[PDB]
């Protein structure tokens, strides 16, 4: 029986739906009983830098509401020196969320949430805006379709120290080889992670899902003589899309607008 105001307007909050550190996502009702996800976020311990990160992706997040419709819908936001409350479409599931409960995904599926992924990063990349952080749950199943909910742009975030709370989270199963050699970022990189959520989404696993140890993970991932497996399957256009994704020199590797074009994408059935 609980409530929030955002721009003078009560919520009533149904259930917590999500959370990261200490931030939330709660599915809740306004006035007119609408469905609506507020995503909560803490300032109290956030420095210039890191507040300035959260403004950034705000404004990002409000100027795309024209520019696609694989975004994340985002109605009214509340910002204050204690918190930000943001008033956004309440979809249907998250992919991750969607990938865990499926025990295999229908062909044409896969195909059609690949296209509203590329499209959306494409969106993204057209501003300017590498996410270097994509996996299944940065994106919201929303009626079938697909939308991206961040851009990435801030890294930090009030750990949760409360919560009857984890240490052993981010897994580094979808990050691209250029970015453990420079420990070069770019377009590339996305296409990479994007890569791997279509190779678990083909496979049922990651490309280096099996390897447990983090460090030899790592090294696997930046190895060239660590060869990828692609085991044979009906789709070989499929087939062809994972080769082209995870090349380790991004120079070779598949952008995102001949992605769009790749026969996997545009001929069906
Ligand atoms: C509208 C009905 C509803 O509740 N939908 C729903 C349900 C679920 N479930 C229910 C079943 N369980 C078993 C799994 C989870 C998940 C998601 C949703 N819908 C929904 N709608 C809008 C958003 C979100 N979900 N959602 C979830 C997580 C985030 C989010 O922003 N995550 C992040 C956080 C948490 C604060 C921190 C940092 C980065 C991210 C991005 C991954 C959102 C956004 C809005």
């Given at each position: 029986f609980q409530s929030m105001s955002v721009k003078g307007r009560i919520y009533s909050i149904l259930k917590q739906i999500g959370s990261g550190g200490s931030s939330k996502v709660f599915q809740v009702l306004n006035e007119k009983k609408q469905i609506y996800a507020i995503k909560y976020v803490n300032l109290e311990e956030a420095d210039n830098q890191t507040l300035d990160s959260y403004r950034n992706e705000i404004a990002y997040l409000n100027k795309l509401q024209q520019h696609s419709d694989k975004i994340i819908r985002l109605y009214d936001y509340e910002i204050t020196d204690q918190y930000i409350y943001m008033v956004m479409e309440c979809g249907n599931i998250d992919l991750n969320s969607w990938l865990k409960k499926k025990k295999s995904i229908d062909p044409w599926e896969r195909k059609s949430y690949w296209k509203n992924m590329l499209e959306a990063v494409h969106t993204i990349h057209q501003h300017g805006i590498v996410h270097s952080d994509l996996k299944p749950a940065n994106f919201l199943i929303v009626d079938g379709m697909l939308k991206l909910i961040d851009f990435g742009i801030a890294n930090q975030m009030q750990p949760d120290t409360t919560s009857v709370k984890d240490s052993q989270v981010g897994t580094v199963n979808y990050m691209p080889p250029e970015a453990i050699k420079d420990m070069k970022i770019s377009p590339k990189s996305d296409v990479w992670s994007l890569g791997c959520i279509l190779y678990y989404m083909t496979?049922?696993?990651?490309?280096?899902?099996?390897?447990?140890?983090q460090i030899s993970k790592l090294h696997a991932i930046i190895d060239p003589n660590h060869e990828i497996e692609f085991p044979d399957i009906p789709e070989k256009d499929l087939q062809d899309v994972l080769k082209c994704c995870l090349k380790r020199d991004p120079k070779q590797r598949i952008s995102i607008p001949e992605l769009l074009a790749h026969p996997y994408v545009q001929i069906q059935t």
């Open positions: 496979y049922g696993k990651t490309p280096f899902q099996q390897i447990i140890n």
